[PDB]
Amino acid sequence: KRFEVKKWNAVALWAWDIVVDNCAICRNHIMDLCIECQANQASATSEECTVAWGVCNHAFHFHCISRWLKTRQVCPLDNREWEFQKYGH
Amino acid sequence: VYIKKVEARINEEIERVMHCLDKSTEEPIVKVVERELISKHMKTIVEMENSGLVHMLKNGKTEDLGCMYKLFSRVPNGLKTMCECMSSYLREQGKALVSEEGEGKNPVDYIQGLLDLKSRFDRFLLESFNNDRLFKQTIAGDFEYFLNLNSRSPEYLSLFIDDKLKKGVKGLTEQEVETILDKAMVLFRFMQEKDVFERYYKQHLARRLLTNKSVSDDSEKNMISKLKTECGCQFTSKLEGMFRDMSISNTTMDEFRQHLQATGVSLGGVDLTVRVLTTGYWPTQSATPKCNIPPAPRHAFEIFRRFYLAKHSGRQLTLQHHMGSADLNATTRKHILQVSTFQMTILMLFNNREKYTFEEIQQETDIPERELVRALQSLACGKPTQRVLTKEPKSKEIENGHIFTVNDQFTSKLHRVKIQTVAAKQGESDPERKETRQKVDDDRKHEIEAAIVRIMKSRKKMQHNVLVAEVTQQLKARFLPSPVVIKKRIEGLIEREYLARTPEDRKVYTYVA
Amino acid sequence: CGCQFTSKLEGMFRDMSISNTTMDEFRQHLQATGVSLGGVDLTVRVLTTGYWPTQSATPKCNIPPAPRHAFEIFRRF
Ligand SMILES: [Zn+2]
Ligand SMILES: [Zn+2]
Ligand SMILES: [Zn+2]
């Protein structure tokens, strides 16, 4: 051949157990509202309900994980302490 | 020359009064002499014209500043107007320097000029004002006032620090590097809007750590130490966390090389410099540009993903193309090219069959839109005399039916020639600026909510505007209070539980979870 | 002698150790690369300039084709 690839320096991304099909807290979906929002428009003003990402790469609704901060907050999908590393999918 | 003459007059008057008159004889005499000379010359001799205070400071007369400071210090309200005029000159210079009208300014040059001005003023202060507290306070206030004016200055500061950190070609030794870093952090001290600064610093970290390594290998510790004595223990922690992610990545590279060697040295993944990062730390939320992976890299990526998915159970290795690089071995000598995972698919298609066009590279490859145009322009348009992908229809704009060819270009004197079309002159186009502004706005909007739910759970209640002052004071060192934004956002949580903060029943708030 | 030159002696012994580690790792990586058949039975060694008196390491001469390919593969790795 005329051009042959010798080295490749790709970067791989990964997530723990985000479950796109279902919030592990609310069991609706990774998107499309939560159990305590229901109607998408209602009185939301651009739907403040977003997706919360922690240092443990686990994804839930920001509303879903905000209700669990009051009591024990141990990211119930693992033993890591839940943080807030990214907002929005 | 008036200051020297009046100083000589004061000296001769005091000598005469102490030698030719009684023993004390000096308090009313010197007081009235000062009140007549300085209190009358103070208003007009420093501002009117013809080398007053502003001109004698612009040209850099150290002796004039020193003698003026040592003379006006005796009379009250002299340092006040001195610092007022100095601050006025500083505002004028900053407005002449922070001017936004006009495109085509170099951010690194702008930050270098600002740092040079700051260093010049600090040297003048040290040499003349004898480190007076009032002058330092006035210059600090002036810097806070004219630097916070622009909201794009933090971005230029981040670009300057990235330029200084990428390679220490200027100032090989460490003393001048340390001094320039201290000056940079001092300049950043009198700066607001730290959120955009941190965001752009993290973006620069991602750019410099996901590219060719061995930039400094030691200055990262100095940077994080300075950021812990300036920002604190907030996002500097996430920075060192993604550095640890890089560490984990290299451990994975060596362990996967060992595993491949045990299961038959992977020929497809001969030099698989694959990297593993987390979504939360690095801003890789846009890691889904599904496009055909070249046969050998496809198999290599599949093998790496299978090894990783098993190693750490649950490792969904998403595929992406907008990161990394590669070394293409071309072949009269064998010169190795370089592709930043953008031209790999087009070059592989050319290897499979030459004489392609835009339709061929847009039909049978499943390519995105903007990145396609960017990569095509980088490979074809705006190329110096080292072209690796030539075309017959020589034109600036991109057509559809244009055939692509290849040129030898023996101008490369080594075997490792790279096409570094990316990371060009800092343009900061409107779409990227708008998207990063929206991202930082959402970041602030969630940060304020996090603060209000972390603080107010252990504090008292507000009636009309009591707790908003506290929440703005806690965020005074972060960014602007934005009263309308916080007022519109605090009333959005009333729709559900956890301190709904009922507006009609504002007498008491629900101190529950 | 003491500890004047014995340390450098054991240092060049460690250089030999590093060299044999390099031989085995390059043999392992040879099957991965192997651009041509030039990289066959390779017994390459890696030493440091300071330890061994190899300051005269610039005989610029041509290499046979199979050794040429082997040296190119080793240099690329
Ligand atoms: Zn949920
Ligand atoms: Zn919700
Ligand atoms: Zn977790």
Instruction: List, as one string, the DSSP characters of B64-99.
Output: HHHHHHHHHTSSTTHHHHHHHHHHHHHHHHHHHHS-
- Please, what's the b/e burial string for B375-398 (b: 16 or more CB within 10 A of its CB; e: otherwise)? bbebbbeebeeebbbebeeeeeee
Query: Whole-angstrom Cα distance, residue B450 to residue B117?
Result: 39
Please answer whether residues B422 and B340 qualify as being in contact, where contact means their C-beta atoms are separated by less than 8 angstroms.
yes
Tell me the chain B residues in contact with residue A62 when contact means C-beta distances shorter than 8 Å: 446
Would you tell me which residues 206-245 of chain B have a C-beta closer than 8 angstroms to some C-beta of chain A? Answer: 210, 238, 241
Q: Tokens at residue B393, please?
A: 């229809």
Q: How far is CA B83 from the centre of its chain?
A: 31
Tell me the chain B residues in contact with residue A70 when contact means C-beta distances shorter than 8 Å: 498, 513
Report yes or no: B335 at the C interface, CB cutoff 8 Å.
no
Query: Whole-angstrom Cα distance, residue B439 to residue B246?
Result: 25
> How many CB atoms within 10 Å of residue B203?
16
All domains in chain A, ordered by first residue: 1-87 (3.30.40.10)
Beta bridge partners of A7: B271, B327
Q: What does B247-303 look like in DSSP terms, one character per residue?
A: HHHHHHHHHHHHHHHHTT--STTTEE--EEEETTTS---------PPPHHHHHHHHH
A78 CA to middle of ligand 3, Å?
Answer: 5
Please answer whether residues C22 and C44 qualify as being in contact, where contact means their C-beta atoms are separated by less than 8 angstroms.
yes
Query: Could you say which of B265, B334, B336 has the minimum Cβ distance to residue C29?
Result: B265
Residues 6+ apart with CB under 8 A from A31: A51, A89
B432 CA to middle of ligand 2, Å?
Answer: 29
Nearest CA in chain C to B268: C32
Query: Could you say which of B275, B442, B443 has the minimum Cβ distance to residue A10?
Result: B275
B214 CA to middle of ligand 2, Å?
Answer: 45
A89 in a known ligand binding site = no
Please answer whether residues A44 and A63 qualify as being in contact, where contact means their C-beta atoms are separated by less than 8 angstroms.
no
Report yes or no: B143 at the A interface, CB cutoff 8 Å.
no
- Please, what's the b/e burial string for B130-148 (b: 16 or more CB within 10 A of its CB; e: otherwise)? eebeebeebbeebbeebbb
Q: Tokens at residue B198, please?
A: 């941190």
CA distance B330 to chain A (A): 5
A35 CA to middle of ligand 1, Å?
Answer: 7
Beta bridge partners of B390: B405
Beta strands in chain A (DSSP E): 3-8, 11-14, 51-53, 59-61, 86-87
Q: Tokens at residue B48, please?
A: 């009117």
Backbone angles phi, psi at A33, to 5 degrees: 65, -175
Q: What does B116-151 look like in DSSP terms, one character per residue?
A: HHHHHHHHHIIIII-S-HHHHHHHHHHHHHHHTT-S
Residues 6+ apart with CB under 8 A from B273: A7, A8, A9, A10, B253
Tell me the chain A residues in contact with residue B331 when contact means C-beta distances shorter than 8 Å: 2
- Strands of the B336-339 sheet, one edge to the other: B271-272, A3-8, B326-330, B336-339
Report yes or no: C34 at the B interface, CB cutoff 8 Å.
yes
Quickly count helices (H) and strands (E) in chain A.
1, 5
Please answer whether residues B165 and B208 qualify as being in contact, where contact means their C-beta atoms are separated by less than 8 angstroms.
yes
Query: Whole-angstrom Cα distance, residue C19 to residue B343?
Result: 38
B278, A88: Cβ pair inside 8 Å?
no
Residues 6+ apart with CB under 8 A from B98: B146, B147, B149, B150, B153
A58 in a known ligand binding site = yes
Alpha carbon distances (Å) from B96 to B89, B101, B146, B427: 11, 11, 11, 22
Q: Tokens at residue A79, please?
A: 């033993």
Query: Could you say which of A2, A7, A87 has the minimum Cβ distance to residue B327?
Result: A7
B279, A69: Cβ pair inside 8 Å?
no
Q: What is the resolution of this structure in A?
A: 7.4
Residue B450 burial by Cβ neighbours in a 10 Å radius (0-12, 13-18, 19+):
middle
Query: Whole-angstrom Cα distance, residue C69 to residue B336?
Result: 15
B267, C31: Cβ pair inside 8 Å?
yes
Query: Whole-angstrom Cα distance, residue B106 to residue B301?
Result: 40
Q: Which chains form contacts with chain C, at 3 or more CB pairs under 8 Å?
A: B
Query: Whole-angstrom Cα distance, residue B241 to residue B246?
Result: 9
Please answer whether residues B361 and B380 qualify as being in contact, where contact means their C-beta atoms are separated by less than 8 angstroms.
no
A29 in a known ligand binding site = no
Tell me the chain A residues in contact with residue B273 when contact means C-beta distances shorter than 8 Å: 7-10
Query: Could you say which of B261, B271, B336 has the minimum Cβ distance to residue C28?
Result: B261
Q: Tokens at residue B158, please?
A: 């981040």
One-letter amino acid of A40: N
Residues 6+ apart with CB under 8 A from B18: B25, B26
Please answer whether residues B18 and B25 qualify as being in contact, where contact means their C-beta atoms are separated by less than 8 angstroms.
yes
Q: Tokens at residue B290, please?
A: 């599904």
Q: Which of B259, B344, B318 is nearest to A7 (CA)?
A: B344
A21 in a known ligand binding site = no
Residue B11 burial by Cβ neighbours in a 10 Å radius (0-12, 13-18, 19+):
exposed
Tell me the chain C residues in contact with residue B260 when contact means C-beta distances shorter than 8 Å: 32
- Please, what's the b/e burial string for B276-296 (b: 16 or more CB within 10 A of its CB; e: otherwise)? bbbbbbbbbeebebebebbeb
Q: Tokens at residue B111, please?
A: 């930050």
Beta bridge partners of A12: B276
Alpha carbon distances (Å) from B38 to A81, B34, B50, B78, B88: 67, 5, 19, 8, 21
Tell me the chain C residues in contact with residue B273 when contact means C-beta distances shorter than 8 Å: none
Q: Which of B377, B368, B379 is nearest to B343 (CA)?
A: B379
Please answer whether residues B468 and B487 qualify as being in contact, where contact means their C-beta atoms are separated by less than 8 angstroms.
yes
Element (H, E) at A80: none
B317, A50: Cβ pair inside 8 Å?
no
CA distance C3 to chain B (A): 32
Query: Could you say which of A6, A62, A70 has the minimum Cβ distance to residue B270?
Result: A6
Would you tell me which residues 341-370 of chain B have a C-beta closer than 8 angstroms to some C-beta of chain A? Answer: 341, 344, 347, 350-351
Q: What angle do CA A16, A22, A23 make, to 5 degrees?
A: 70
Q: What angle do CA B407, B392, B397 make, to 5 degrees?
A: 110
Query: Could you say which of B294, B318, B344 has the minimum Cβ distance to residue A13?
Result: B318
Q: What does C6-69 look like in DSSP terms, one character per residue?
A: HHHHHHHHHHHHHHHHHHHHHHHHHHHS-SSSS-SS-------TTTS------------HHHHH
Q: Tokens at residue B169, please?
A: 């070609």
- HSE of B393, CA atoms in CB hemisphere, 13 A: 10
DSSP assigned state of A81 = P
Beta bridge partners of A87: A52
A2, B331: Cβ pair inside 8 Å?
yes
B264, C31: Cβ pair inside 8 Å?
yes
Alpha carbon distances (Å) from B182 to B134, B175, B185, B220, B376: 22, 11, 5, 15, 42
B305, A12: Cβ pair inside 8 Å?
yes
Instruction: Report how this structure was experimentally obtained.
Output: cryo-EM
At which residue do the structure tokens 């103070």 appear? B42
One-letter amino acid of C61: C
Query: Whole-angstrom Cα distance, residue C43 to residue C45?
Result: 7
CA distance C52 to chain B (A): 28
Query: Whole-angstrom Cα distance, residue B378 to residue B272?
Result: 25
Residues 6+ apart with CB under 8 A from B129: B65, B69, B135
Please answer whether residues B372 and B398 qualify as being in contact, where contact means their C-beta atoms are separated by less than 8 angstroms.
no
Residues 6+ apart with CB under 8 A from B372: B361, B362
Query: Whole-angstrom Cα distance, residue B317 to residue A14?
Result: 5
Please answer whether residues B158 and B111 qualify as being in contact, where contact means their C-beta atoms are separated by less than 8 angstroms.
no
Tell me the chain A residues in contact with residue B329 when contact means C-beta distances shorter than 8 Å: 3-6
Alpha carbon distances (Å) from B188 to B165, B185, B207, B467: 16, 5, 21, 29
Torsion, Cα B30 B32 B34 B40, to 10 degrees, reads -170
Residues of A with CB under 8 A from a CB of B: 1-17, 36, 42-45, 48, 50, 53-55, 57, 62-63, 66-67, 69-71, 83-89
Query: Whole-angstrom Cα distance, residue B77 to residue B88?
Result: 17
